[PDB]
Amino acid sequence: MFYTIENAVPIHLLRTGDEFSTGTYYFDTKPLKMTHSWQTNRSLGLPP
Amino acid sequence: GVGVSTGSFNNQTEFHYLGDGLVQITAHASRLVHLNMPEHESYRRINVLNSEAGVAGQMVQDDAHSQMVTPWSLVDANAWGVWFNPGDWQLITNNMTELNLVSFEQEIFNVVLKTITESATTPPTKIYNNDLTASLMVALDTNNTLPYTPAAPRSETLGFYPWLPTKPTHYRYYMTCTRNLTPPTHTGQAGTITNTISAPTHSDVMFYTIENAVPIHLLRTGDEFSTGTYYFDTKPLKMTHSWQTNRSLGLPPKLATEPTTEGQQHTGTLKAATDREGIHQTINNSYTEATALRPAQVGYNTPYMNFEYSDGGPFLTPIVPVYDTQYNADEPNGAYRITMGYQHGQITTATELGRYTLNPISKGGRAPNQEFNQSSPLQMENTLNGTLLPTDPIGGKTDIHFTNTLNTYGPLTALNNTPPIYPNGQIWDKELDADLKPRLHVTAPFVCKNNPPGQLFVKIAPNLTDDFNADSPQQPRIITYSNFWWKGTLTFTARMRSSNMWNPIHQHTTTNDNIVNYMPSNIGGMRLYPEIPQLIPRKLY
């Protein structure tokens, strides 16, 4: 599977006064949860 | 005004037959809930240990945890027999394929607060003065800010009888425990094992108090505390159990020798092994029926009795419950062994508590003494060293077979859900707030993807003695109790079954040796022995 860069993506030549602006990519991801969980199977449910 | 009633006792399960088969099982429940006062109003983090696991070999007997005992009492609806007498649960195991779950509302009404008072005469005489001015604290956790602790796996729900007055149980939840139990040993030798619970780590100690989390409605003796109608969003359960297995999926091979005589002692004979045709998963030429081409396996070999060990402690891996083989094993298939109280079943005489080792009847389970494994080439009439029979030890341990370690949960593993257990099982359950959600819960068949319904915390407000309340650890109080009714309404939704076949299926009958399990005796002894659920059969393919 031999991908060359020239035959795949169009390439903008840029002189010394350039401005190459990528368009605003909008993600579609799951929301991460920074809150870690501590409960385990000796900590789930109702204690005796 | 005190002398005006506030609610209606109601316990009829209206089967409101809608169109096209759908029904709307509106199940009411109403029980007198006798609340005693809290013995202490201070919050207590009680570490629990035991000397039983500190001696070598009793490491299943592991009761040690860290418990957060709160004075609040929890009124729980999350159990099946609260809503369903056996006359109405016979109607749903006979006739309903699916059960959706729709609505839920709670209501505390008609509270009766009383003061008990001791007089000093020659017997202990107690005078029940009526409190017109005292209050009790209710707290509907409408966001589930508190840890959701269902009382069904501890059999600590409201009692399943209408006339018998129930009791609410004390709300308590697990605090962080950092368990030290290694080394894990045998029983025979002695080891220098360390059985201590350590100091709780700083990053995870999670102390929920009830007052600073949920707003609390004080209620005098003419109250009416109405929970709003909670609307569920659950998967539709399927009461119809599946019987098809990988020796029963697909199209059977055609036979040339068909029988002639009456009676199933004579068997039809198939074609030759090497002469049959079709798609096949091995290299060898002969197409037997064992090695066939089946869409996906039903069930999965759990590594059973497998004590995992997490920051909490040692624990057994929960197995998806499924119908055992013809050889009753029930331990690698996840049996239920539900011990009840005298509010939950159990004829109220001098005996100990009833047991009922149960299973569902969805035929997807395996046996550990009936399995085997082979080498990579197939080789019928197999070599002694090429096939792993379950007589073989693992590491020199003769009672332990390959299936104790062997797991076969591949991606193509079809699986039936948890059976609902009656009357003692759990109805709904909180979705585990994790990044990877589990596919099914073994504790309860209905899963609430949204915020689960609000558990209800009830506690008597402190009725205080004349004695001072500053610079004192424990204050004296007026001893008191309460009698508040509790009305629920759990609106199901279910589809009627349609018989698309010839022979009549197994319905939940009533035999001559079964009416004693359904009728009161000369004393008043009642019983709620279980019902083996999921009776209607269905095809899995």
Side-chain angles (χ1 to χ4, degrees):
Chain A
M1 203 76 195
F2 175 72
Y3 285 100
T4 182
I5 288 90
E6 291 86 2
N7 287 318
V9 52
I11 291 170
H12 294 89
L13 284 163
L14 296 177
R15 295 288 187 89
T16 183
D18 56 352
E19 192 269 332
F20 179 72
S21 66
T22 302
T24 64
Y25 177 74
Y26 293 101
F27 286 97
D28 193 1
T29 62
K30 271 82 70 176
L32 189 153
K33 291 188 289 296
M34 284 295 293
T35 59
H36 74 278
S37 68
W38 62 271
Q39 287 181 353
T40 324
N41 297 106
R42 298 292 302 276
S43 297
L44 297 180
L46 188 141
Chain B
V2 49
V4 177
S5 178
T6 60
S8 176
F9 186 86
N10 197 2
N11 208 353
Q12 286 84 36
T13 306
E14 296 179 355
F15 292 98
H16 189 271
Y17 291 94
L18 273 71
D20 32 354
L22 298 173
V23 308
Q24 186 177 2
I25 304 166
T26 299
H28 295 281
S30 293
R31 281 86 190 270
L32 190 145
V33 182
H34 177 271
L35 178 65
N36 214 168
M37 76 175 184
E39 65 271 15
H40 298 287
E41 294 178 354
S42 64
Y43 286 85
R44 298 188 303 275
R45 180 176 67 184
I46 297 170
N47 289 321
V48 177
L49 284 173
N50 50 358
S51 297
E52 294 179 352
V55 65
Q58 292 78 3
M59 293 174 181
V60 182
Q61 293 174 356
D62 192 76
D63 289 330
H65 64 281
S66 63
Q67 183 179 358
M68 182 61 219
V69 176
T70 67
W72 289 81
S73 298
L74 189 145
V75 174
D76 199 1
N78 195 359
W80 282 104
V82 182
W83 308 96
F84 287 153
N85 48 357
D88 291 328
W89 183 252
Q90 198 193 19
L91 193 275
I92 306 169
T93 43
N94 286 327
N95 290 315
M96 280 73 168
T97 60
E98 72 178 3
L99 268 72
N100 199 357
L101 188 59
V102 174
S103 177
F104 183 71
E105 61 178 359
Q106 291 174 353
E107 177 175 355
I108 289 177
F109 64 99
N110 194 356
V111 69
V112 176
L113 292 171
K114 287 185 180 294
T115 284
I116 184 170
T117 300
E118 178 68 29
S119 178
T121 185
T122 50
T125 299
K126 301 183 265 76
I127 294 96
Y128 294 97
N129 296 115
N130 209 166
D131 282 331
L132 274 299
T133 61
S135 63
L136 85 169
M137 291 184 282
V138 77
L140 191 275
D141 193 3
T142 187
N143 300 115
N144 280 314
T145 301
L146 280 84
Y148 183 76
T149 64
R154 296 294 188 272
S155 292
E156 292 184 355
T157 325
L158 274 70
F160 313 126
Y161 298 105
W163 57 90
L164 294 178
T166 70
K167 289 181 70 67
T169 57
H170 298 282
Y171 177 66
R172 71 270 188 192
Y173 60 96
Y174 290 101
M175 199 59 75
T176 66
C177 59
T178 56
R179 181 66 185 276
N180 293 319
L181 205 237
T182 312
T185 63
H186 296 279
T187 305
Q189 75 268 10
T192 62
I193 66 170
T194 63
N195 189 4
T196 58
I197 183 169
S198 178
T201 57
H202 61 278
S203 64
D204 56 350
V205 170
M206 203 76 195
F207 175 72
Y208 285 100
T209 182
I210 288 90
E211 291 86 2
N212 287 318
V214 52
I216 291 170
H217 294 89
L218 284 163
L219 296 177
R220 295 288 187 89
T221 183
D223 56 352
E224 192 269 332
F225 179 72
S226 66
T227 302
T229 64
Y230 177 74
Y231 293 101
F232 286 97
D233 193 1
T234 62
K235 271 82 70 176
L237 189 153
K238 291 188 289 296
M239 284 295 293
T240 59
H241 74 278
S242 68
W243 62 271
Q244 287 181 353
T245 324
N246 297 106
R247 298 292 302 276
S248 297
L249 297 180
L251 188 141
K254 65 183 292 294
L255 73 162
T257 300
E258 293 181 354
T260 311
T261 64
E262 180 69 25
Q264 294 179 356
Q265 62 183 358
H266 292 173
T267 61
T269 301
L270 290 171
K271 293 176 70 67
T274 63
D275 290 334
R276 287 190 294 272
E277 64 186 3
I279 303 171
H280 174 66
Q281 284 292 109
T282 66
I283 288 178
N284 55 2
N285 292 318
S286 64
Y287 293 174
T288 185
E289 187 64 24
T291 64
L293 193 273
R294 295 291 186 267
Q297 74 264 14
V298 290
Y300 66 100
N301 288 327
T302 313
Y304 60 96
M305 304 302 108
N306 205 169
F307 290 95
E308 287 182 355
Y309 191 149
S310 182
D311 294 326
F315 61 94
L316 182 141
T317 59
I319 305 101
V320 172
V322 70
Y323 178 64
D324 54 348
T325 58
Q326 295 85 20
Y327 292 144
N328 293 319
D330 292 332
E331 281 155 341
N333 294 315
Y336 289 101
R337 183 74 168 179
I338 306 170
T339 293
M340 307 178 289
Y342 288 166
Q343 291 177 353
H344 300 89
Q346 288 174 359
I347 306 100
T348 326
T349 61
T351 59
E352 204 183 3
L353 309 176
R355 69 283 187 195
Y356 57 98
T357 301
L358 288 180
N359 284 316
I361 55 173
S362 68
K363 284 93 178 66
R366 282 81 46 207
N369 307 26
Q370 186 249 41
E371 288 186 352
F372 64 101
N373 193 359
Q374 291 181 354
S375 69
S376 53
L378 268 298
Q379 295 177 356
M380 293 78 163
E381 299 181 354
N382 47 7
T383 306
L384 298 171
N385 291 317
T387 175
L388 207 158
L389 276 312
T391 65
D392 291 328
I394 296 297
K397 296 295 183 181
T398 62
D399 199 6
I400 299 164
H401 300 170
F402 69 99
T403 179
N404 296 110
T405 313
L406 184 270
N407 192 2
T408 55
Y409 179 68
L412 35 86
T413 301
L415 185 60
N416 297 113
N417 207 357
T418 302
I421 316 100
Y422 289 86
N424 290 301
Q426 187 179 356
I427 299 172
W428 60 84
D429 190 72
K430 181 172 177 65
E431 173 63 40
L432 297 179
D433 186 75
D435 291 319
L436 276 72
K437 298 182 289 295
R439 294 180 67 188
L440 80 162
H441 291 280
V442 70
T443 181
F446 286 102
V447 184
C448 298
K449 277 85 68 177
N450 55 359
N451 210 160
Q455 55 186 357
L456 190 62
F457 302 104
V458 184
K459 189 175 78 69
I460 301 299
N463 188 1
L464 294 180
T465 304
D466 199 8
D467 293 333
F468 62 95
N469 295 318
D471 289 330
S472 66
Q474 184 177 2
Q475 72 273 17
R477 289 177 293 167
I478 287 96
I479 307 168
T480 182
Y481 62 94
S482 176
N483 290 317
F484 60 96
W485 295 93
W486 176 77
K487 180 171 73 176
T489 296
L490 182 61
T491 300
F492 288 88
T493 290
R495 184 177 295 118
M496 294 299 295
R497 72 108 184 275
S498 67
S499 179
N500 287 317
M501 61 198 296
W502 178 270
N503 54 356
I505 61 170
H506 177 263
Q507 304 296 96
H508 185 266
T509 179
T510 302
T511 66
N512 287 318
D513 294 331
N514 209 168
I515 45 93
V516 73
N517 302 117
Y518 287 137
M519 291 303 290
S521 68
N522 294 322
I523 295 175
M526 287 294 294
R527 74 279 288 149
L528 284 178
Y529 286 107
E531 175 168 355
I532 294 96
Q534 291 181 356
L535 282 83
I536 300 101
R538 63 105 178 271
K539 69 193 74 174
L540 190 142
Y541 185 66

